[PDB]
Amino acid sequence: LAATLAQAL
């Protein structure tokens, strides 16, 4: 999840 949300940046 962390890496998935990180795609926002």
CA dist 7 and 5 (Å) reads 5
Resolution (A): 1.1
CA dist 5 and 3 (Å) reads 6
CA dist 1 and 9 (Å) reads 14
Q: With residue 3 as reference, give the H or E element that holds it.
A: helix 2-6
Residue type, 8: A
5, two tokens: 């949300």
Question: How many CA atoms does the CB half-sphere of 1 hold within 13 Å?
Answer: 0
